[PDB]
Design a protein around this ligand. Sequence first.
Ligand SMILES: Nc1ncnc2c1ncn2[C@@H]1O[C@H](COP(=O)(O)OP(=O)(O)OP(=O)(O)O)[C@@H](O)[C@H]1O
Ligand SMILES: Nc1ncnc2c1ncn2[C@@H]1O[C@H](COP(=O)(O)OP(=O)(O)O)[C@@H](O)[C@H]1O
Ligand SMILES: Nc1ncnc2c1ncn2[C@@H]1O[C@H](COP(=O)(O)OP(=O)(O)O)[C@@H](O)[C@H]1O
Ligand SMILES: [Zn+2]
Lengths: 379, 370, 370, 120
Amino acid sequence: EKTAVVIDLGEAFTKCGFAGETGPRCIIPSVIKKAGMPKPIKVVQYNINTEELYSYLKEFIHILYFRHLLVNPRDRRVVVIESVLCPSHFRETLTRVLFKYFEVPSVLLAPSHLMALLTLGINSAMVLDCGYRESLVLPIYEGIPVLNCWGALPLGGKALHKELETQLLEQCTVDTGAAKEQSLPSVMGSIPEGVLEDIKVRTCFVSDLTRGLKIQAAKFNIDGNTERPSPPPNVDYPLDGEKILHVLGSIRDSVVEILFEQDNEEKSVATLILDSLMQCPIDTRKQLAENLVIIGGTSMLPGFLHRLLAEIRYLVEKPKYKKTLGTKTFRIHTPPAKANCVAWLGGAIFGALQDILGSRSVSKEYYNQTGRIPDWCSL
Amino acid sequence: AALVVDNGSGMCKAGFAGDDAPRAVFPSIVGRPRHQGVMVGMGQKDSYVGDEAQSKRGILTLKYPIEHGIVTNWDDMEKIWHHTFYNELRVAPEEHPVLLTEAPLNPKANREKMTQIMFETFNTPAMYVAIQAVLSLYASGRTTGIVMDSGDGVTHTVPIYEGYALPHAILRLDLAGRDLTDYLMKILTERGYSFTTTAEREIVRDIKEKLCYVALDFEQEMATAASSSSLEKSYELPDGQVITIGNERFRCPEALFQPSFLGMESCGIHETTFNSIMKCDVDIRKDLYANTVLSGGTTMYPGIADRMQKEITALAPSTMKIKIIAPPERKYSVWIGGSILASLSTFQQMWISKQEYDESGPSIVHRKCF
Amino acid sequence: IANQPVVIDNGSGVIKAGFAGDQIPKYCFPNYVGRPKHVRVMAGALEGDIFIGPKAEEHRGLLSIRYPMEHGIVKDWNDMERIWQYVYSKDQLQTFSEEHPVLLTEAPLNPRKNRERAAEVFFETFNVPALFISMQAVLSLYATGRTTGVVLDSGDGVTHAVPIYEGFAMPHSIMRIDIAGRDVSRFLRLYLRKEGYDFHSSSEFEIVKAIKERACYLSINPQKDETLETEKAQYYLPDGSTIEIGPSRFRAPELLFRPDLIGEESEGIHEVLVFAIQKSDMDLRRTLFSNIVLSGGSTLFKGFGDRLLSEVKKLAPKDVKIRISAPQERLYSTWIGGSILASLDTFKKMWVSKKEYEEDGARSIHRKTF
Amino acid sequence: KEKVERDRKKLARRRNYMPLAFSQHTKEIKIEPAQAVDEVEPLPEDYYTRPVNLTEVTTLQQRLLQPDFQPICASQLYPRHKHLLIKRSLRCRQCEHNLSKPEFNPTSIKFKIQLVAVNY
Ligand SMILES: Nc1ncnc2c1ncn2[C@@H]1O[C@H](COP(=O)(O)OP(=O)(O)OP(=O)(O)O)[C@@H](O)[C@H]1O
Ligand SMILES: Nc1ncnc2c1ncn2[C@@H]1O[C@H](COP(=O)(O)OP(=O)(O)O)[C@@H](O)[C@H]1O
Ligand SMILES: Nc1ncnc2c1ncn2[C@@H]1O[C@H](COP(=O)(O)OP(=O)(O)O)[C@@H](O)[C@H]1O
Ligand SMILES: [Zn+2]
């Protein structure tokens, strides 16, 4: 047998490499540069025609299997990591591309949350997945994902990128280099997603709960006269060479707060753990609480894990969660690989198990016969 | 060298003949997971059993294989016996002969199919089925006297005088520990604390065992429960959440003494014990009043013996002296009897062999049962 | 006071109000409190911080929906007081609560604290002449006009099966499971995300309930419809955008009849009906199968009666007549029953007066319930 | 263990003897599960009231090229080995061979089997 390849198709970035390795070999933006198109189209797009999606995935998998990885597709197996409740037609297409065009031996559709649990070694743990599109949580108890007690909110990368763009356009101060030393607002109508992502990573950080709670009430201005903490210094960011955008200190520590803002509904990234944990079985409560896992690149943002764990323990004392989750000890697990590449590492650890892989995985001979991929929906 | 294996509906007590207490005591349950179409993680057992299923209660649907001392699912019971011999006891069933326990006045198919498995599946050298009540007397070193062996599955009253049992005087009542556990859920749901799932029912059994106690005067206890909050005790769940059960503490075990609460329309555990003695011969009644034994774990309720004495004394004549026999080890009263029986050299002859089973069939058990 | 009594159904999803004289409930509005989604500091926004029923439906996308009652139990009492205050508003009824007496319809086997607090509010906050808490199941029979009948009342919050024979309800044979219409709405949202349409917001949960109510058919065989390629019927949203539901349409309400699929440990809607009949005495079983009544909104699913009949038949004994008599007004059946009950002169005796509650104590409401 | 269990289960189904007990039925590796920290390290107080030089911190593109330990600072970021390129050979569905390249494709523009639509 040969070392099975691991792919993990995401909206922002795709993880790729081989099984039984310390981390992924290639990690790249999930896009393709088609002739005529100035900006490259995104390879994973939900709610489009199958033929157009088929062509994009055919183009992308080709780049992964030749330019990034150097190996024959037909020779060795595949371990496709994809999140639970991934759209039906997308997963059906992705398999149909691998089985028909590339003619792979067998694909294994592992849920990202159960794979993240294997990397630690613990059999039972709560898993939060703060991705690009949606920040999803799914309790895993001793190998069994509990779909009953699922939770998701659109407070990921996309929702954060959009919030940054909005704030920058309000307090817009750019030095074009054409008598634009004076503050010039909205010279460009929209900012490209590639720039916004680079600003987010380098400039913006996650504030402490004490400082963050003041920032929330400050921008609200709820019958108070200038009750904001002192912001960090303003950082100057180059746009397309000559144009120098002066990023305000307030924007850096306020953009993140949309994730941890209550917004009346009581629906934050913090609340989603406690909302799910309260809905879980009464016996499982204390085991899941003690074993928390925080995967996804959105949680890589500096000082996110401290704010989350703090915001949890504050929301615990709130009267809604005070009865059930009152006297619970919330402890976070530190996975071996980085927060972005926890999902991938599980699939590699699973891919190294050649004996179990072949049995669980769906063979091409079965797919060609039936034409029915197994899912958590009815058969 | 011989094995005693009590097949109780609540807990399966198994061990070696001659030993003081049973070696392996685990809850008699099979844990099948609430699986979706999503793939399962590693270290996955298709069906968990006993202490393993008791650890992984959260996800697994707990299904008791024996219901009212009748084996409903035999495939499940086979998996428990496989966990009993191979894993728990660490002994081959082909080497040692196995003594099992059946409740009295059970269906004939139960004893028939029980022995068939032991002889064919496990290939045991000898197999003897015994009445739980008959064994329970040996524990107290008493040949004479009636027993009120109330289990999780059933409660039965077997009067035995001078080492001779009265079969027609035997009375069976379906009211037992599991019905009380089911009753305790309903009245706890009336207070506020809702328990629905099979895993939650197991937590309600832990609440029952620890807090619940038998009241001497129920009407007097309800008056004190209403006025003062002295009887109200707190219990911590597996979750940090704590609950204050209140009057429902002593309301649960009352169902034993008056089944009207459960709504069975039958005689109480006190009244059935009296009725059984009255069905017996007039002469021997004296000793049965003097030697009334309480066996099983449904007679480990704090102050059942005091309430039992009071209720029997009222029904029974005034001149008679009513003494209730409550040994410290009531839970293991069925097994400890089995250990004494199996050890005795006389019992060596009473064993049913494979040769005897092969020639006659499984019907031989009905002749050499009791 | 002789002035006409006000019937009010405490439906988790939709509360139905009106006078006892009316043949149908004039005022029935959704049971949820509407507050502005964005925390309003500024002027020119939604004022009051309270939007109930038709006002909420108008400005739905702007507000944040919070249901005060979950699984036939009141979680937030402050919210429920505002809802009952809106029942006695200029919008609906337009009367004094102090003048007219009241009839509540609490689900069976609810917490006793739920009934006690419900009475306290209606006696203290509103100055009611008299109050009477009743079972939802018992009313449903008055509406149809038959004494004997099992009532499978599938509401939004709770689905319960109560067997009543010749005006006698067996309280032990009652069966209650939490998997109701609201859970079907929750599971449909999950399958809609599996089709690729997110409804993350609490306002966006309301349109999932609308999608369910509009387009969701129960297939007689679920396995055949899954293999068959779907039409993918388009539904139009409030904004104007179209969504192709496809296979999610039929495999969402299936979770009523088979709740193990998602991973919820419950019996199922076909099972609770049969179990409730089988739990009752053997003589009545035939008549209770011969008289089944569907109540509540979570029976109006297209081909519910067709599936239930088939699923009941295989579980029920062979060659037994099974008549599932659904009225045309299933959603409003529970209220019509109360409206008839309230009109009768016997109701004058049944309810508890305000002075009675002050003197007798707390028990007054509980003891007069039945 | 699962393979042996699945094999034993499968050969028992294939045999179709209804689990007939002919013979007697029935070293361990134990990993310690990772310890959960009570409190994760907070964001350093330096980040508050300090000028951020965009030269010192690394962009996403150059962060992600070193995935095994993607470092925020530039001083941590080490140079990775140069990525090897591929020499493609085409094979059809119906037809077998089609075209291919030599064993010394480095500094060579020669095809072992030249085939193209413009050349027919
Ligand atoms: N200390 C206790 N106090 C009250 N109830 C108890 C106590 N211990 C156990 N119980 C209850 O009574 C039952 C006793 O079961 P036990 O361990 O005696 O096995 P069993 O299945 O009843 O066996 P057998 O029928 O042979 O006696 C338990 O299932 C539990 O519900
Ligand atoms: N190392 C990093 N540091 C900070 N932010 C990151 C880092 N890597 C990714 N991110 C951000 O978090 C997001 C993570 O998305 P990712 O989990 O890779 O995608 P998906 O959820 O589709 O699988 C990216 O879109 C990016 O904005
Ligand atoms: N026509 C319909 N088709 C399908 N489901 C419906 C329909 N009407 C109502 N429902 C469902 O039933 C619920 C109404 O329950 P309802 O009968 O008001 O309960 P209750 O008896 O507790 O008042 C709605 O919230 C919805 O989920
Ligand atoms: Zn060709």
